[PDB]
Design a protein around this ligand. Structure first.
Ligand SMILES: Nc1nc2c(ncn2[C@@H]2O[C@H](COP(=O)(O)OP(=O)(O)OP(=O)(O)O)[C@@H](O)[C@H]2O)c(=O)[nH]1
Ligand SMILES: Nc1nc2c(ncn2[C@@H]2O[C@H](COP(=O)(O)OP(=O)(O)OP(=O)(O)O)[C@@H](O)[C@H]2O)c(=O)[nH]1
Ligand SMILES: [Mg+2]
Ligand SMILES: [Mg+2]
Ligand SMILES: [Zn+2]
Lengths: 72, 426, 439
């Protein structure tokens, strides 16, 4: 289900890198975002969250600290 | 039920973990062989948190002991309480990391991470429902800080919903006998921000000061420093082992104390620290414990809370105590030290009370305080790192084993961001 | 006469429930194993216990409780303690891990795995009832299980039963005393659910009961057993008219519709009067007039607000023991004539009165004197709005920079739900201030 929303939120703002920053899927809930297998969640209103550090972050807010071409 | 698995990485990790298993088995009255000889059923009621039941009324701790070098396995096995771990969790290398993070993360640790993951798995399905991993390690070298942190990368990669605790012994400028500590700490904290639920920064200079001017010992050995951090480790996890009038839990402390996901670095303190003589000249009272926990001399990190602002605090008490006392002492501290607590959080303290106290004492407390005072230590580490890095000193050792000049720059920018993000709250 | 089911949620609820059942079984003469020795009972039968116990086992009484917690520990203490033999084990419900002070865990992530089991257990207890009076829910607003799982359970009850009353004995966060950093998020996030899915909420705060323990009982070092005993005496007094005959008895349903002037204005401040030190009880005559006068002093209120900052919408006084109805009318007249006690002018009467012949019983422990007269006041007042304003102010102080919000959002909550629960609280504030206007 969320695979469409995880795809959408990754590239509505297009990736500008010389090699595209990875957002492949291995299976359900396990996405290798930027060579790292995150754990992904959503429930309602399509709000999409990543299990990181001391807690949780938004999937877009995560990329806004982790892909160099989202910085500028 | 609600199990924890314990991991020891490096000599520091191994030696702290040894004293930790000593104090745990003393608390539960476990025979060094593995038998039970206590007098209370409350110990049996949660013996399964840290131990597995074996045939013949024998308990084996739920621990793994790891480093790339075999000398500390022999010491821990032949030492006191040595023959309690099943001799399969000890998974040791043969070369060592030589205080180098490259060896820990890329060349030697990478060839042993499979052998440790296969044992963490075997421990993970032997439990009803573990809630977290405890890693005990030093930021001094590859060993704990690069191998034991590749370990948390892989553990997070497969157990993301669980809690990661690391009792990271951070390096200190006034104690070091490694010259590469600034490189190892900076590389370690680079990934420790992503891969950990809560990180307790300890350094040996504070534990020496506590021995010199609180316990009145003039020659404090690592056996004595390890006692303090083992008593902290027992205190922070004692709530899920014994009934209490108010309950903490690892997930409880996480949400009460981490306000934003990045701000999860903590400084411990322990309250009834007293010399063997001066103990009879003092009251066994909650006011005295509570004032001691907030004293800048008593913190287990070299940074003093005086220069920073507390974001959140946890105080887990152990003993037959009354909540009205704790509540008024907490208000006392927060009111007349109001300049030392952040303004945009109204209540900064989280309280837990446990009915079973440590051996030998009537009352104790473990303090954990999240504060903008932690970032000055990170500034000292970053200053020591950038002094060596501008000359590219010792850089060949790491470069010839996998890193480039890019990785060091990435680590220093991201630790500079961590101190920028902590000072944002004044 | 009829029967009601009590649900004890989370550690505060379970611990209060222990004292409440220690009080009921001792009041009805039932021993900790559930047996009750054959008394005289001239006339045949004893229907006092039917309200709270089922007779099944030829001399065995089992209480109409559900104990539920997402956390094992306190339920295992009940399975181990003196009263472990009362409850048949299937009604002591238990999760694997706690909400850990997070509402979104106890509502969305973790509560949804235990609701399907407690709903079955209450549907099983209610079918055993010949006629249901209501639901007595014990919980706390500051906790994760207490806040989130009880909020979820209230909507489930409202859907399944609808018109059956639901009394709610909730522990509220104290103004200054607070043992958790995040209590204001959990206590705004209950509020919508306690507005919409509850008939009477008797919020009680711990620093008010600490003051009662210091000022009235002379207890220097009070602990939750003493506080929970005071709530147990409130709950026993509220349901006394349903268990014993009285000169002027009041039904639970008629008691609400008397005290609640409007569908939302449903938050009575609880109080208990002859609560005094076991030695100082020798020096006081303890008649009706002075125990009525105790109910109106700020120091006796079980919430940290003083009624002089508002107006009473209504009171009820649940007298029990040796109270003659002629004295009660005189005491009420004195209260009405006395100034500094303000009632809104569009309620001329402003009182419901209930008199019961059973005096309060005292459990062993020496916390309380054996007294022949007691009153529980509970009263509906616009003074309660200050407790909620000082708490919604704490919520704003933290939410103005999202101070812990990632723990709730990451547990499957939209951040609009915080703003909705906040503006809902503010609307309730405006509702309570507008009825503060004399017409
Ligand atoms: N508190 C504490 N610190 C210790 C102890 N032993 C050593 N340390 C600290 O940690 C460092 C030891 O490095 P470790 O990584 O623990 O283990 P190691 O086996 O020496 O690692 P390599 O030899 O570099 O592979 C020392 O320089 C000290 O800073 C101990 O028992 N307790
Ligand atoms: N009066 C009273 N208050 C209590 C008692 N135990 C805890 N509290 C308070 O109730 C609030 C919530 O605590 P808990 O009841 O432990 O929370 P919980 O509902 O079990 O929820 P989680 O543990 O977060 O899942 C806090 O303010 C506690 O101090 C008790 O026996 N009586
Ligand atoms: Mg070693
Ligand atoms: Mg429990
Ligand atoms: Zn990119």
């Amino acid at each position: 289900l969320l695979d469409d929303a995880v795809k959408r939120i990754s590239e509505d703002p297009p990736c500008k890198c010389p090699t595209k920053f990875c957002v492949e899927r291995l299976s359900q809930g396990r996405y290798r975002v930027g060579e790292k297998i995150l754990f992904i969640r959503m429930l309602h209103n399509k709000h999409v969250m990543v299990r990181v550090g001391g807690g949780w972050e938004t999937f877009a807010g995560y990329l806004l600290k982790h892909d160099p071409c989202r910085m500028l | 039920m609600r199990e924890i698995v314990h991991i020891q990485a490096g000599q520091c990790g191994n030696q702290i973990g040894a004293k930790f298993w000593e104090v745990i088995s003393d608390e539960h009255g476990i025979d060094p062989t593995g038998s039970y000889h206590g007098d209370s059923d409350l110990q049996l009621e949660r013996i399964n948190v840290y131990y597995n039941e074996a045939a013949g009324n024998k308990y084996v701790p739920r621990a793994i002991l790891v480093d790339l070098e075999p000398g500390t396995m022999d010491s821990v096995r032949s030492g006191p309480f040595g023959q309690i771990f099943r001799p399969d969790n000890f998974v040791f290398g043969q070369s060592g990391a030589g205080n180098n993070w490259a060896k820990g993360h890329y060349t030697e640790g990478a060839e042993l991470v499979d052998s440790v993951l296969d044992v963490v798995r075997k421990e993970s399905e032997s439990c009803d429902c573990l809630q977290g991993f405890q890693l005990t390690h030093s930021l001094g070298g590859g060993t704990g800080s690069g191998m034991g942190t590749l370990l948390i990368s892989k553990i997070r990669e497969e157990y993301p919903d669980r809690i990661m605790n690391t009792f990271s012994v951070v390096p200190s400028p006034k104690v070091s006998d490694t010259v590469v500590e600034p490189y190892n700490a900076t590389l370690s904290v680079h990934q420790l921000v992503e891969n950990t639920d809560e990180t307790y920064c300890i350094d040996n200079e504070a534990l020496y000061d506590i021995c010199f001017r609180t316990l009145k010992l003039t020659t404090p050995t690592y056996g004595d420093l390890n006692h303090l951090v083992s008593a902290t480790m027992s205190g922070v996890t004692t709530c899920l082992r014994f009934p209490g009038q108010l309950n903490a839990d690892l997930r409880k402390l996480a949400v009460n104390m981490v306000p934003f996901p990045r701000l999860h670095f903590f400084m411990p303190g322990f309250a009834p620290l007293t010399s063997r003589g001066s103990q009879q000249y003092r009251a066994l009272t909650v006011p005295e414990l509570t004032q001691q926990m907030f004293d800048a001399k008593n913190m287990m990190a070299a940074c003093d809370p005086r220069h920073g602002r507390y974001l959140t605090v946890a105080a887990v008490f152990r003993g037959r105590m009354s909540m009205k006392e704790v509540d008024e002492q907490m208000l006392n501290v927060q009111n007349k030290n109001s300049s030392y607590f952040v303004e945009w959080i109204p209540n900064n303290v989280k309280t837990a009370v446990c009915d079973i106290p440590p051996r030998g004492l009537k009352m104790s407390a473990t303090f954990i305080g999240n504060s903008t005072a932690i970032q000055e230590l990170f500034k000292r580490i970053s200053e020591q790192f950038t002094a060596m890095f501008r000359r590219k000193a010792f850089l060949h050792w790491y470069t010839g084993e996998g890193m480039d000049e890019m990785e060091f720059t990435e680590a220093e920018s991201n630790m500079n961001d961590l101190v920028s993000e902590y000072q944002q709250y004044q | 006469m009829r029967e009601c089911i009590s649900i004890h949620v989370g550690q505060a609820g379970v611990q209060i429930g222990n004292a409440c059942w220690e009080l009921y079984c001792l009041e009805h003469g039932i021993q900790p194993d559930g047996q009750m020795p054959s008394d005289k009972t001239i006339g045949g039968g004893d229907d006092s216990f039917n309200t709270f116990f089922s007779e099944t086992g030829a001399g065995k009484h089992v209480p109409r409780a559900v104990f539920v917690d997402l956390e094992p520990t306190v339920i295992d203490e009940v399975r181990t303690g003196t009263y472990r033999q009362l409850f048949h084990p299937e009604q002591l419900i238990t999760g694997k891990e706690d909400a850990a002070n997070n509402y979104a865990r106890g509502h969305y992530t973790i509560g949804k795995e235990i609701i399907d089991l407690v709903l079955d257990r209450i549907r099983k207890l209610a079918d055993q009832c010949t006629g249901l009076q209501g639901f007595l829910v014990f919980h706390s607003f500051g906790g994760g299980t207490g806040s989130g799982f009880t909020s979820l359970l209230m909507e489930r009850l409202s859907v399944d039963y609808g018109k059956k009353s639901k009394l709610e004995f909730s522990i509220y966060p104290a103004p200054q005393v607070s043992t958790a950093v995040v209590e204001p998020y959990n206590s705004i996030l209950t509020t919508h659910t306690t507005l919409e899915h509850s008939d009477c909420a008797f919020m009680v705060d711990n620093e008010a009961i600490y003051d009662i323990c210091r000022r009235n009982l002379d207890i220097e070092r009070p602990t939750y057993t003493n506080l929970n005993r005071l709530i147990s005496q409130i709950v026993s007094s509220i349901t006394a008219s349903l268990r014993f005959d009285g000169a002027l008895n009041v039904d639970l349903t008629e008691f609400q519709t008397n005290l609640v002037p409007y569908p939302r204005i449903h938050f009575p401040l609880a109080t208990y009067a002859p609560v005094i030190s076991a030695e100082k009880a020798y020096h006081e005559q303890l008649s009706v007039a002075e125990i009525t006068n105790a109910c109106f002093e700020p120091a006796n209120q079980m919430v940290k607000c003083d009624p002089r900052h508002g107006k009473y919408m209504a009171c009820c006084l649940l007298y029990r023991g040796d109270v003659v109805p002629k004295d009660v009318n005189a005491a009420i007249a004195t209260i009405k004539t006395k100034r500094s006690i303000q009632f809104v002018d569009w309620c001329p009467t402003g009182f419901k009165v209930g008199i019961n012949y059973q005096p309060p019983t005292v459990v062993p422990g020496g916390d309380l004197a054996k007294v022949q007269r007691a009153v529980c006041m509970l009263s509906n007042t616009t003074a309660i709005a200050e407790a909620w304003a000082r708490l919604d102010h704490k919520f704003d102080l933290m939410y103005a920079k999202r101070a812990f919000v990632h723990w709730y959002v990451g547990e499957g909550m939209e951040e609009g739900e915080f703003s909705e629960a906040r503006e809902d609280m503010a609307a309730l504030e405006k509702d309570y201030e507008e009825v503060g206007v004399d017409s």
